[PDB]
């Protein structure tokens, strides 16, 4: 280009006056300056040459002049900041606050982490702890620490009851050098899809994990899923281990490996695996795999005793989790 940087700036400016301002006659103005400058066959070197062109006003020349000196524009910086549909996506980075809540805070004035902490009365318990450990929850968890966390969790589970099965899933299970959090899939032969719902099989693990000081906060304690906060034991060291997000999911025995498969995923891998079951005439859920007919009529859930059965069913060779990108 000769003037791309100017027209880019100008069009973005224009779309603000139509989207956000609904001041449509400044849209039309900014557009005019884009078209002419875009048709002007020389490289603009300052704002006054533009002001000549029958569409670049003083204020636009006033705008263009800034862009060619710094390499940026102050007007567009704060507009990119104050976007309602981008400030909503930063508030959702706090656990507990979905877009539902994120909408509820932004147009009421609160849109920043400082302003979130300027009005804690407007946010529930889950959201408050999420807001408190926010920076910690930003951090990655090195594999080293994941391996330690796994030790604690898996040792406590086995001690409680040999019949419990616990698998740490997610990118960790795919052998990733770092993780965002920990997600434990847990089952017990007393809990099946036909059986009567058994919240204490989950409760007992969570409580033991609190007893040994690994679990430090509860965000969400359900009947089949726990969401909370956890922390490695230190001794006493400058900035000890940061607080980590942990989830524990209790699944029915007969639906467990479908769960492990799903939660170990990779998103992309799960999609590709599901499309493929579908090509072979099977449907895969995080709970079951079933024959699928002609129409979307699904049949009876097939027996799964391992991740391997599911691969067998859809005619794939087993994939190591490490190879599930």
Residue ranges of the chain that CATH labels 1.10.150.110: 1-82
**HEC secondary structure over 263-305:** HHCCHHHHHHHHHHHHHCCEEECCCCEEEECCCCCECCCCCCC
Residue ranges of the chain that CATH labels 1.10.150.20: 83-139
For residue 50, give every residue at least 6 positions away whose Cβ sits within 8 Å of its Cβ, in sequence order, or none.
Answer: 6, 33, 37, 44, 56, 60, 61, 64
- CATH superfamily to which 1-82 belongs: DNA polymerase beta, N-terminal domain-like (1.10.150.110)
Residue with the two structure tokens 């079933």: 290
Residue ranges of the chain that CATH labels 3.30.210.10: 263-325
For residue 284, give every residue at least 6 positions away whose Cβ sits within 8 Å of its Cβ, in sequence order, or none.
Answer: 258, 273, 274, 277, 310, 314
Secondary structure letter of residue 229 according to DSSP:
E
Q: Note if 63 is an active site residue.
A: yes
Does 56 count as an annotated binding residue? Answer: yes
Q: Which fold has domain 263-325?
A: Beta Polymerase; domain 3 (3.30.210)
Contact yes or no for 168/153 (Cβ under 8 A): yes
Does 94 count as an annotated binding residue? Answer: yes
Beta bridge partners of 291: 282
Classify the phi-psi angles of 72: left when phi > 0, otherwise alpha if psi is within -120 to 50, otherwise beta. beta
Does 71 count as an annotated binding residue? Answer: no
Beta strands in the chain (DSSP E): 141-142, 165-168, 178-179, 182-187, 215-221, 225-230, 244-250, 282-284, 289-291
Does 140 count as an annotated binding residue? Answer: yes
Given in angstroms, what resolution was this structure solved at? 2.1
Contact yes or no for 284/310 (Cβ under 8 A): yes
CA distances for 324 relative to 217, 232, 251, 288, angstroms:
32, 28, 22, 19
For residue 235, give every residue at least 6 positions away whose Cβ sits within 8 Å of its Cβ, in sequence order, or none.
Answer: none
Does 157 count as an annotated binding residue? Answer: no
The domain 83-139 having CATH identifier 1.20.1050.10: the answer here is no
Cα four-point dihedral sign 75, 81, 86, 87: negative
Selecting among 63, 197, 200, 280, the annotated active-site residue is: 63
User: How far is Cα 148 from Cα 244, in angstroms, rounded to an integer?
Assistant: 13
The second-level CATH assignment, the architecture, of 140-262 is 2-Layer Sandwich (3.30)
User: How far is Cα 168 from Cα 158, in angstroms, rounded to an integer?
Assistant: 14
Does 92 count as an annotated binding residue? Answer: yes
Contact yes or no for 170/318 (Cβ under 8 A): no
Residue ranges of the chain that CATH labels 3.30.460.10: 140-262
User: How far is Cα 9 from Cα 70, in angstroms, rounded to an integer?
Assistant: 13
Q: Which of 230, 250, 249, 228 is nearest to 241 (CA)?
A: 230
CA distances for 297 relative to 5, 219, 289, 293, 302, angstroms:
55, 38, 13, 6, 15
């Amino acid at each position: 280009t000769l003037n791309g940087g100017i027209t880019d700036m100008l069009v973005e400016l224009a779309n603000f006056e139509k989207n956000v301002s609904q001041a449509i006659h400044k849209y039309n103005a900014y557009r005019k300056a884009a078209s002419v400058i875009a048709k002007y066959p020389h490289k603009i070197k300052s704002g006054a040459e533009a002001k000549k062109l029958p569409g670049v006003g003083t204020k636009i020349a006033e705008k263009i002049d800034e862009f060619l000196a710094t390499g940026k524009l102050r007007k567009l910086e704060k507009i990119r900041q104050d976007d309602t549909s981008s400030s909503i996506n930063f508030l959702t980075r706090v656990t507990g606050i979905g877009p539902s809540a994120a909408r509820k805070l932004v147009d009421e004035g609160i849109k920043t982490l400082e302003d979130l902490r300027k009005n804690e009365d407007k946010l529930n318990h889950h959201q408050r702890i999420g807001l408190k450990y926010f920076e910690d929850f930003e951090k990655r968890i090195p594999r080293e620490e994941m391996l330690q966390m796994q030790d604690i969790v898996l040792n406590e589970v086995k001690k409680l009851d040999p019949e419990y099965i616990a698998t740490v899933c997610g990118s960790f299970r795919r052998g990733a050098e770092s993780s965002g959090d920990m997600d434990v899939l847990l089952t017990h032969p007393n809990f099946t899809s036909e059986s009567s719902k058994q919240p204490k099989l989950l409760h007992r693990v969570v409580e033991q994990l609190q007893k040994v000081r690994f679990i430090t906060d509860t965000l969400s304690k359900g009947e089949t899923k726990f969401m909370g906060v956890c922390q490695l034991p230190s001794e006493n060291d400058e900035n000890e281990y940061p607080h980590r997000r942990i989830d524990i999911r209790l699944q029915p025995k007969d639906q467990y490996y479908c769960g492990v498969l799903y939660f170990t995923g990779s998103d992309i891998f799960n999609k590709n695996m599901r499309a493929h079951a579908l090509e072979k005439g099977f449907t895969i859920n995080e709970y079951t795999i079933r024959p699928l007919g002609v129409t979307g009529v699904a049949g009876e859930p097939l027996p799964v005793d391992s991740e391997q059965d599911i691969f067998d069913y859809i005619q794939w060779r087993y994939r190591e989790p490490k190879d599930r990108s």
